[PDB]
């Protein structure tokens, strides 16, 4: 079905670097903000998301810890990756538990998929993704409980264009870290 199709496409995703543009719109479709940046990904759960517009921010997952860095105020925060990603579509690619898929209703038309969490008490009300049969992700979007949607368009995807260093976070000089990880 659509779930097995999506999973088989996500299974073909391997490491890559891509540029992205972001469009955030509110419940009525009004423009909230636009942005752009770079994304580096390495299965099953590593990534470096670097926004340059409207503000510069970095999100790095080294597979265990999620680091968020805000260069503007020279501050970084660390939380466990499991905590930042639990109950999000991330789990659908980060592992392969049929249980995760049971949490969503899915609808497909070609490369377009819409995932709707079955629960009404969640972070996301809806998630969409456009990914080719070859595993190339073209776009995705997340709709928050506040009805606000954040849409992302990927371009210039280069498979293999990553290095281990991209998925590690070393706070630059002068940057203070608020480590929110309970040990």
Curated annotation (Swiss-Prot):
Biological process, per Gene Ontology: lipoprotein localization to outer membrane; lipoprotein transport
SUPFAM superfamilies (alphabetical): Prokaryotic lipoproteins and lipoprotein localization factors
TM helices/strands, residue ranges: none
Keywords: Chaperone, Periplasm, Protein transport, Signal, Transport
Subcellular location: Periplasm
Subunit structure: Monomer.
Similarity annotation: Belongs to the LolA family.
Record-given protein name: Outer-membrane lipoprotein carrier protein
Provenance organism: Escherichia coli (strain K12)
């Amino acid at each position: 079905d659509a779930a097995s199709d999506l999973k088989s496409r996500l299974d073909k995703v391997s490491s890559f670097h891509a540029s992205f543009t972001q469009k955030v719109t509110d419940g009525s479709g009004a423009a909230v903000q636009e942005g752009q940046g770079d994304l580096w990904v390495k299965l099953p759960n590593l990534f470096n998301w670097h926004m340059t517009q409207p503000d510069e921010s970095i999100l790095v997952s080294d597979g265990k810890t999620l680091w968020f860095y805000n260069p503007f105020v020279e501050q970084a925060t660390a939380t466990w990756l499991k905590d930042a990603t639990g109950n999000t579509p991330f789990m659908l690619i980060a592992r392969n538990q049929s249980s995760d898929w049971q949490q969503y209703n899915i609808k497909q038309n070609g490369d377009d998929f819409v995932l709707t969490p079955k629960a009404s008490n969640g972070n996301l009300k809806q998630f969409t993704i456009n990914v080719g049969r070859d595993g190339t992700i073209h776009q995705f979007s997340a709709v928050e409980q506040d009805d606000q949607r954040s849409s992302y368009q990927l371009k210039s995807q280069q498979n293999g264009a990553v290095d281990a260093a991209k998925f590690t976070f070393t706070p630059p000089q002068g940057v203070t870290v608020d480590d929110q990880r309970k040990l």
